[PDB]
Amino acid sequence: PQITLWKRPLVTIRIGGQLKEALLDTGADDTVLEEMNLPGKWKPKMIGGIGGFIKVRQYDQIPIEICGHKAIGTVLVGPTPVNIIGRNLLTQIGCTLNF
Amino acid sequence: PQITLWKRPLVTIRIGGQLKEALLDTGADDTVLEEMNLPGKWKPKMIGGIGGFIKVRQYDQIPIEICGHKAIGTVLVGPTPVNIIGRNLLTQIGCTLNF
Numbered sequence: 177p178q179i180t181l182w183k184r185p186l187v188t189i190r191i192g193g194q195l196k197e198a199l200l201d202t203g204a205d206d207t208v209l210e211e212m213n214l215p216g217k218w219k220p221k222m223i224g225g226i227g228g229f230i231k232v233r234q235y236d237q238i239p240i241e242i243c244g245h246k247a248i249g250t251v252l253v254g255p256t257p258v259n260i261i262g263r264n265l266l267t268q269i270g271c272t273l274n275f
Numbered sequence: 276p277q278i279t280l281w282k283r284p285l286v287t288i289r290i291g292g293q294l295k296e297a298l299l300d301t302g303a304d305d306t307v308l309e310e311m312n313l314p315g316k317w318k319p320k321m322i323g324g325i326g327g328f329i330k331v332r333q334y335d336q337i338p339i340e341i342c343g344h345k346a347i348g349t350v351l352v353g354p355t356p357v358n359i360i361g362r363n364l365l366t367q368i369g370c371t372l373n374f
């Protein structure tokens with residue numbers, strides 16, 4: 177599809193039994209999801225943006241379905257105000273910027 | 276151009292005869308540049324990111340040429356981690372997401 181940017185590029189994602197709305201975010205290196213209790217091993221990390229840093233938990237090889245497209249990779253979980261699909265998964269679903 | 280996302284989508288922008296590198300950031304509503312001087316009236320504003328809120332200076336109707344595409348719009352100046360081109364200007368240059 178083609179997503180214009182008149183509004184926030186929010187799309188439906190699935191992670192296990194949770195459907196969430198998430199931003200397709202070219203400015204995000206990594207995917208950052210709102211607090212959720214995912215199974216498996218993780219490692220602590222700090223990520224920085226406008227305002228400073230937040231602490232997140234890094235989970236690897238997590239399958240995520242983004243608008244029907246399959247992805248699998250690292251997801252960072254922590255107290256973000258919005259779910260963010262970053263470049264690590266955007267590439268996997270074939271996403272480009274065009275103008 | 277078509278821009279893939281295996282690398283950060285950094286582009287050269289022209290603003291006030293200066294060349295800067297800025298990140299095409301679909302997860303940003305607003306264009307926010309690191310501390311710089313711009314002419315004219317500005318308004319104090321606050322904006323929030325992943326790490327909390329910051330103070331910025333809001334400049335309206337500023338020309339920026341992004342990859343040779345002309346925009347004229349609002350530019351926020353303040354302590355962002357990196358120069359970002361947000362949706363307010365991405366829309367002006369006809370940028371869309373495609374997958």
Ligand SMILES: CCC(CC)CN(C[C@@H](O)[C@H](Cc1ccccc1)NC(=O)O[C@H]1CO[C@H]2OCC[C@H]21)S(=O)(=O)c1ccc(OC)cc1
Nearest residue numbers: 203204205206223224225226302303304305323324325356
């Ligand atoms: C370092 C570049 C940029 C920060 C500039 C990175 N951010 C992604 C942005 O797209 C966030 C994504 C974001 C969106 C909404 C809320 C928090 C974060 N947008 C953002 O801060 O936009 C601000 C400018 O416009 C405003 O509109 C939205 C918030 C304001 S991020 O959320 O902080 C972030 C995401 C992933 C990541 O992985 C290492 C590290 C940081």
